[PDB]
């Protein structure tokens, strides 16, 4: 799921107070036993 | 098949608990045997029949058979108790299944010597000899428990004191011939169809029972071991 929402400047970095639903974009099948996750930046 | 922790841990002064899990076909119908082996020297019996201990083994070791698994307890371990612990059991399918070993490491008189090893041509092999000195060979059984360098131990074949029925392992069946003689204490084991996967020591282990360890499921054990030869075929 993914959704773009206005995040206009506010108080120091934190999750803003506002409702925003998330619509699905891709539904690719998978069957792996996933139990961990590692992020990555440029 | 027997499940055993690879390498546990522990601090001096307190006690640990080494366990050995097995199905009802081997442990549920027989008695587990715990063996202790110091790194470098020959192994030795630690606990037999899960209730009694030999004369050399002190009261610092105890074993229990609650359920289908065996439990070891060493009250007040020290630096001298840093050795390999193996579990062994005779399965009802005419075989002797050993454990994997427990590296319980913490950083703070009759001779049974045998010989007959040496590097030989692959495919074929030679005979494996064994001897002793005044131990009533007729009233005791013998086992062949080989140990690869760095690996664990496994049972190869058994000869009873009567000299009748004998048993081999699941892989050495057919191409192995174990026999004795009416002469002084000796044991002959001829090997055939050498597949080069036999780099071990072939311990000629002494036992205490008389018949084959299949009818006597409460007295079978293993007496003091002997200095074995290092046979390395290496193709």
């Amino acid at each position: 799921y993914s959704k773009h929402t206005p995040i206009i400047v506010r108080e120091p970095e934190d999750l803003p107070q506002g409702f925003s639903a998330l619509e699905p974009l891709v539904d690719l099948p998978i069957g792996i036993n996933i139990t961990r996750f590692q992020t990555l930046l440029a | 098949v027997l499940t055993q922790p690879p390498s546990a841990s522990g601090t001096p002064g307190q006690r640990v608990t080494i366990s050995c899990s097995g199905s009802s076909s081997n442990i549920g119908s027989n008695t587990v045997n715990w063996y202790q082996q110091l790194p470098g020297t020959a192994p030795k019996l630690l606990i037999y029949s899960n209730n009694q201990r030999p004369s050399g083994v002190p009261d610092r070791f105890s074993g229990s058979k609650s359920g289908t698994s065996a439990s070891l307890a060493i009250s007040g371990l020290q630096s001298e108790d840093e050795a390999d612990y193996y579990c062994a059991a005779w399965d009802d399918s005419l075989n002797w299944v050993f454990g994997g070993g427990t590296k319980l490491t913490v950083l703070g008189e009759v001779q049974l010597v045998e010989s007959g090893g040496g590097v030989v041509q692959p495919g074929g092999s030679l005979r494996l000899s064994c001897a002793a000195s005044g131990f009533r060979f007729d009233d005791h059984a013998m086992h062949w428990v080989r140990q690869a360098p760095g690996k664990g131990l496994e049972w190869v074949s058994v000869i009873s004191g009567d000299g009748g029925s004998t048993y081999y392992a699941d892989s050495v069946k057919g191409r192995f011939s174990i026999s004795r003689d009416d002469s002084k204490n000796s044991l002959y084991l001829q090997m055939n169809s050498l597949r080069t996967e036999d780099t071990a020591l072939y311990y000629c282990a002494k036992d205490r029972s008389y018949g084959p360890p299949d009818v006597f499921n409460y007295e079978y054990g293993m007496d003091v071991w002997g200095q074995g030869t290092t046979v390395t075929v290496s193709s």
């Binding site: - | 098949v1 055993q4 299944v97 050993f98 664990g152 496994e154």
Partner: protein, 50 residues
């Protein structure tokens, strides 16, 4: 030899998950290190036909 057959595994498989394996099984806790010792083989048992 064209029709392979895997052997027992110490853990249960997952639905819709391929089980391609080429290592050597380790019975209990004794690593046989490639060379087949006791109760340690490769899970590539070839099916026999006639």
């Amino acid at each position: 030899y064209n029709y392979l057959y895997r052997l027992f595994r110490k853990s249960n498989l997952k639905p819709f998950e391929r089980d391609i394996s080429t290592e050597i099984y380790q019975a209990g806790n004794k690593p046989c290190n490639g060379v087949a010792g006791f109760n340690c083989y490769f899970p590539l048992r070839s099916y026999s036909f006639r």
